[PDB]
Amino acid sequence: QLTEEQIAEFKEAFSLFDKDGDGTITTKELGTVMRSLGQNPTEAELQDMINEVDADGNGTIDFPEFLTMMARKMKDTDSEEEIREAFRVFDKDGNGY
C-alpha cells in the first residue's frame, strides 16, 4: 500500500522533472537534466528508453506512468546495486562519505 507522503513526494518529483509544467517529462527536458547531472546519453538510447518506459508508441510520459515505474520491485541484488551506484555518483570527491 502507498502513503500520502509517498504520493506527495512522487508529485514533487514529477513537477521537478520538467522545467515547464505541461504534464509530460518531455524528451528535451530529460536530456537537459541528464546533461546537467553529467551524463550524455545517445539519441537512439534515449528513444529506446522512452519506448520501453511507455506502454505504446505515443512517445510521451505521464505521471501515472512514472508512478507505475517507481512501483517496480528490485528484489535484493538490484537494490544493493542501485544504492551502490547512487553512492558512487554522490561520492564524486575522494573522501569516502
Next chain:
Amino acid sequence: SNSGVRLDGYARLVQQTILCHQNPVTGLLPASYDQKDAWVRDNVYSILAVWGLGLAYRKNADRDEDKAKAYELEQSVVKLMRGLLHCMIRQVDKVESFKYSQSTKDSLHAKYNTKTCATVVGDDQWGHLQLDATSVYLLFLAQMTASGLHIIHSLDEVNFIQNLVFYIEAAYKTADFGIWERGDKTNQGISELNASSVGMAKAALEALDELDLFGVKGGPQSVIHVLADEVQHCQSILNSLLPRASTSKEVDASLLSVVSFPAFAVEDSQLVELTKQEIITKLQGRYGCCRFLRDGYKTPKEDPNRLYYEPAELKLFENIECEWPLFWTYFILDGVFSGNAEQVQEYKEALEAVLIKGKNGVPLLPELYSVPPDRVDEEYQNPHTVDRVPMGKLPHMWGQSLYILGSLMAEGFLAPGEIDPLNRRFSTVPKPDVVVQVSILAETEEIKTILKDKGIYVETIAEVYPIRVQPARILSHIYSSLGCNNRMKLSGRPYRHMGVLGTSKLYDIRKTIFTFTPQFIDQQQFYLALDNKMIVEMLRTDLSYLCSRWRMTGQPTITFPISHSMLDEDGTSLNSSILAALRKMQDGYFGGARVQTGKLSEFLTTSCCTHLSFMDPDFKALVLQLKETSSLQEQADILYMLYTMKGPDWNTELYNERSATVRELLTELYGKVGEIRHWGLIRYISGILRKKVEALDEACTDLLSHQKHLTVGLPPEPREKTISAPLPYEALTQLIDEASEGDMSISILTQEIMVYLAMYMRTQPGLFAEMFRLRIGLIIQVMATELAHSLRCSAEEATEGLMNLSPSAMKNLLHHILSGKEQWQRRRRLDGALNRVPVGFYQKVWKVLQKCHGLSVEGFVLPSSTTREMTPGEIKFSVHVESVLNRVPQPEYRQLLVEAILVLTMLADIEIHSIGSIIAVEKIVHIANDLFLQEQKTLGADDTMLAKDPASGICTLLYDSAPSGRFGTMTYLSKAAATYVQEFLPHSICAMQ
C-alpha cells in the same frame, strides 16, 4: 444581337468541323482520318453538338433564316438517325439469332461501312459485340423523340425497336468487349462484363419504358413495354459492381459516362463522389485522364503492328499511359450540369491549354498525348514530369462535339432541361417511402369460413367476376407474343420468368382487369412452395424487395390465395406460420415493409395499371408388379427403372379404359406424395422429371457479381470444370447434369444449395466474405459428415437422413455451417474443407513471394517471378495461389500450411533480409511435429498419446491443440520456421528490428 453573333459563330465552327463530313445518301459520318468506316457510338456522340445547336436555334424563331437553319439541323440529325436505323435493320437475322443463345458470333457488327450501308469486316476479324453503343443509341433516340423530333416512323420499325430492347435487356448476364473493344487489359480474344455497358442498358430501358415514338399523334399501338425486373437486376449488379471498373480493371475512366450527363444511370450520390475522387486520384494527368491502368494503346513499343499482346506488361506500359481530353470534357459536362460553377471554370481553363489550333485558327481536340520514346525512363522515375506530344486523330469528332456541347451549356444559350426532357437529372433524389397493398383470396367456401371465424374477412375466388386471377405462366405466355412479326421473321420476346415486380402491377386486356399471383406459389414447378416456413420466409423476402426499390410509378398490389396445401393434418384450420403472417400483416407491418389489408376493388382506384394493345383482335409382368407393389419408395424406384430401360415416353398400358403415358403416372405419383408430405422419393421424382429451379441463371450471375468462383460436384482432377463467366440457362443446366452424372438427386441437391447461397448472399453478405471459391460437392460431403457425426450412423444412413430432411432444415443446416457454430480437429477439418482464409492472406503471400525465391509444398514449385506479372488486387494471382495450395487433399494439412505461411510472413516482417532460396512448408510442419513429439516424450506422455496419422504422419494432439497458448501450435510452427531459416542461413542469424 450579340447572342445571334455567338450562335452564328458556333454554327460556322460546327459546320467547318463536324458537318463538313456529312456523307450524303447515307448520312453516316466517317470516323476521322483515312478510315472510311463509321462507328455507331462515334456518330451518336458527334450528332449531340448538332442537336444542341438546332435546339438553341429553334428558340429564336419567327425569322425565315433562323427557322431554315433549325430545320436543316433537325433534318440532318433525323437523316443520321435514319441511316443508323437502316444500318441496324440490315442485321435483323443477326438480332433474331442473338435473341436465343447469347453468343459473340450472333450479334450485329459494331463497325459499319460508309454509303451503300454494307458490312466492311467479317464476323471473326473484329469484336462484334458492344451492347453499350446500341443501348446509348436507343436512349438518345428516346431523348430526341421526347424532345419533339420524329425518328421512329413505321410499325415495322417499332417491332424492330422492341426486338432490340429484348436483345439488349440480357446485358446484365453477358460479357462484351466494352467501349475499347479489347475486353480486359490483355486482349487474348477474351471478353468480360463491363459496368458501363449494363448501366447504359439500364438507362436505355428506363428511357423507353412507356415512350410514344409517334409523338403526340401516336396511338396505343405504337408504345414500348419494358419490364422492370431486368432494370432492377441491372441496378443491383451495378451497385454490387461499382467500387472499381470490372472484375479485372481496378479503375476505368469510362465509368464517368455512367455517373455524369450521359444516361445518368446511377444513384447513391456518395458513391458517385467516391468514384469521381478515385478516378481523379488514379488517372488525372497534365493533358487529360488516362483510359485505364496498364494500357498499351498508342505506345512507342509493343510492336504497334501486332494484336493479342502477350502477358509481358509488368512495367512496359506502366506510368507512361496516354491521356485523353474527352474525359476532361466529360468532367466539365458533369460540373456544368448538376450544380457546379467553379469546377466548370477551372476545367475549362485547364482544357484551353491542351487545345491545338487548326486551319484558320479553328480549335481542335487531339485524340491523345503520347510520351516521346527518348524520355521514357524520366517519366518512369518521375511520373507526370515529361512533356507529351499530340498524335492520333487530330479532329476527334467525339471530343470536339462534347467540348462544343459543354461550351454551349456553359455560355447559357442552352438549358439542362432541353437535352434531357425525360427529367433524368433528379435520379439521385432519395425516395421517401412506399406503401405496398396486398389482398387475400379464398379458393373455396370452406377456406373463407375458416378465415372468417378466426377474425379475418376475405373474398372468395368467385364474386369478383370483373377481376380474374391466374398464375404467372399465363402472363409469361402472353408476353411471349409481344413484338411478333411473321413477315420479318421475328419470334418476339422469348419465354422468360418474371419477378415479383412484374406480377405486382395490374394488367388490362380486352377491357378486363387482370391480376396475377406471384410466380413463387406454383407448387407444380417445384416443391419449394410446399414448405410453409419457406413460404412465409421468402414471402417476407419478396415483400422487402418490393418495398426497397419500387422504381415504377403507381402503387403495387399483391394477391395471396390460400390454397388447400398448407392446412393442418386434420384439414380444419390454418397452420401457425401462415396465421401468424396474416395477423402480423393485419397490424400494418410485415418484415421491413408497411402493408394494409383491403379489397381488390378498393385497390383498383389507385394502382399501377397497364394496357396491352397488342392483344387486341417381361413388360406385362413389370407393369403388374409395379401396380401391385407396396412400399411407395420401391414403387418410385421401379418407376425409375421402367423409365430408364423402356419408359421414356412409351405407354405402360397399366389402365385399359384410357391409355396413360409414363409422364401422367409420374405426375399422379408426385401429386399423391405431396399430400402425405414425405420427403423420401420427392427428390427422385424431381430428378426423373428433370425439373429445374426457376431463375437459376439469375442466382448464378448474382453469385458471380461478387468476384466468386463456383465448382459443380465432388472434385476430381479431370472433371468439375470451374465457371468464371455468366452462362446461359441451357448450358448451365447441361453443366449441372454432367457434373451430377447418374446420381440425378445430386443435381437437385446442388440446385437447392446454390439457390440458398444466392438467397443468403443478398440478405447477409458477410458470411460469404473471405471466401474465394464455393464447391457444392465439398459442401455436400461436409454436411453428410456432420450429420453422420451427429447421428453416429453410417454414410448411407447420413445420406438418407439428408434426403429426408425438409428444405427449411437444409437452409437451417447450411446457415449453421456457414456461421461455423455448434473438437479442434473437427473445427480444423471444417475450416480447411471450406478453404477459409484471412482477408490479407493474398497480400501476405504476395509479400512472401517478393521476399523469397519460392515456396515448396512437397510437389511442384511456385516461382517468385510471377509477382511482377500480377498484382495483389488481381484475382488471377489469388486463384493461382489457391490452386497451388489446393494440391494437398487434406483440409487439416491445408490449414497447417496456411498457418505456417502466416507465421513465415510474420517472421519475414520481423527479419529484414532476403532468404535467397526455396523454403518447404512441408519440411517446416514435419520439424514442428517432430519437436512436439519430442516435447511430449520428455513430458511423460505414453505411446497412446503420441499417435500417428494413418496418411499424414501427424500427431492427433497437434490437430486437437489450440492455436494460441503456452504450448499452442503457433509456437511450434514459429520454432520450426526459425530452425529452417537458420538451416538456410550462412551459419548466423539476420533478424533485427
Next chain:
Amino acid sequence: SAQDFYENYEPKEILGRGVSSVVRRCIHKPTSQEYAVKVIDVTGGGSFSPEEVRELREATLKEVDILRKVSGHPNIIQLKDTYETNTFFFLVFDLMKRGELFDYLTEKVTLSEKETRKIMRALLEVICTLHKLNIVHRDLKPENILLDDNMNIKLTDFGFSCQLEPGERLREVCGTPSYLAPEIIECSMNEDHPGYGKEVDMWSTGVIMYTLLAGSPPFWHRKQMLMLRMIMSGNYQFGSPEWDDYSDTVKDLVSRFLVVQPQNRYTAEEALAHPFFQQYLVEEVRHFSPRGKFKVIALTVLASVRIYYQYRRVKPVTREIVIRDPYALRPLRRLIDAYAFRIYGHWVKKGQQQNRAALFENTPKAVLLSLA
C-alpha cells in the same frame, strides 16, 4: 397506435438480431434523427401457447418500467419512445455507430490501461447508480455492453433487471455459466441458501475486468461440471507470463473483486475510493517538517536512479532465445496471439461452448490431462 409509429419511424436495414428480436435503424421524420427501433413479436410465429405470449408481455412491461425508472442518465441507455401493438412491440432508443464491447475486444485482443481504467470507472458509476435505486442487473457480460463514437460504455438489456425490496431474495437459476456466484449454486443445491443478493454484480465486474485484462475469462473448461466446481471452489489463479508486467493495484482490485465471500467483497463505493480511480489536479496543503522534505528528496533521487537504469536493462533481440522459446519476447507473443486471433476471429459469438479462453491452451496436453 401502430399508424403513429409507422408515420413517425421509418424502418431501415437490420442492425442486429436476438433470440426473438430484430434491431433496425429508424429516422424521426420531424427531426431527421438517426435513432434505432427494436421489433419483438408476441406469438413467436404461432410456435408457443398464449401463456408464453403473456409472459413475454409481462417481461417487456417490466423492462420498460425499469428503464423509465432510470431514464435521464447519460451513461445509461434511454428509452425515448415506447409503443405496444397486438402482435408487435415497438421501442425507440439511441443508435450508436460502434459495436458491442465483444467486437472491440475481439478486434483489439487486449485493451490499454487508460481504456480499461475508464471502462471500469464508468461501470462502477452505473452499478452504484443502480444500487442507489435498488435495482439488480445480474447480467453484466462483455457482449451485453456497447460503445459509441466517444468510447463511452452504456449498459443495456434491461429486460432482465427488475425492482427489488430490502429483505427479499430471488431464486431463479440463469445466466452465463461462467458468471455465477457461490450464492446461486448454494441456493440451488436443494433449498438451503436463502436467495440472490448484491455481490453477484461485484463478481460480474471482477470477471469483466479479468476478461478484458488477461484476454480470457478467469474460469473456462471443456466440461460444465468441472467449470462449475472450479467457480464454486474459487480457485482462480493469475497467469505467470501474462500478469507479470502490470501494476500491483490491478491485481489487488481484481483479487478483492473476485472474493468468494459476499461479506468480504468490496462495495462499489469502496472501489471508487481506491487510488486507482483517484485523480489529483493541484494542491497547496502539502506542507510538513524538513524531515518530510528530506524524505521527498530521497524518494526523488531513488526514482531518478531507477529510471537511469531502464535503458541499460533492456534486452537485445536474442534470436537464440526465440529459437528456444518465442514466448520470452512480449511483443512477439502479442504479435503471434493477434495473428492467431485474426486467423480464427469468426468463431467468437454468444455461448459458453466457444469463447476467448477456448483459443488459449495454457495447460500441457500430456498424460496428466487424463486425471480429473
Next chain:
Amino acid sequence: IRGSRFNPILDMLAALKKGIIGGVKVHVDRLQTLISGAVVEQLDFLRISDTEELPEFKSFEELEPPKHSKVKRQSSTP
C-alpha cells in the same frame, strides 16, 4: 388537395388521364412536345413601342418548400 377533397381531385385527374372526361376527348402529354410543331401567335407591337423602359411581366414561379413545418404532402387524414 388537403382533407376529404383529396379523393375527388384524384378521380378527376384519372378521368383526364384516361382520355375522355365529361363527354370530351382529351390528350395528356408533356408540355414541350405539345408546344413544338404548333402554331404560335406573334405580338410584335411591343418591340415597336417607343417606351424607354420595357415593362416587366411577372410569370408563374415554383413555390419553395417551407422551412418551419415542412409538410411533405401527408395523407388525406379525414
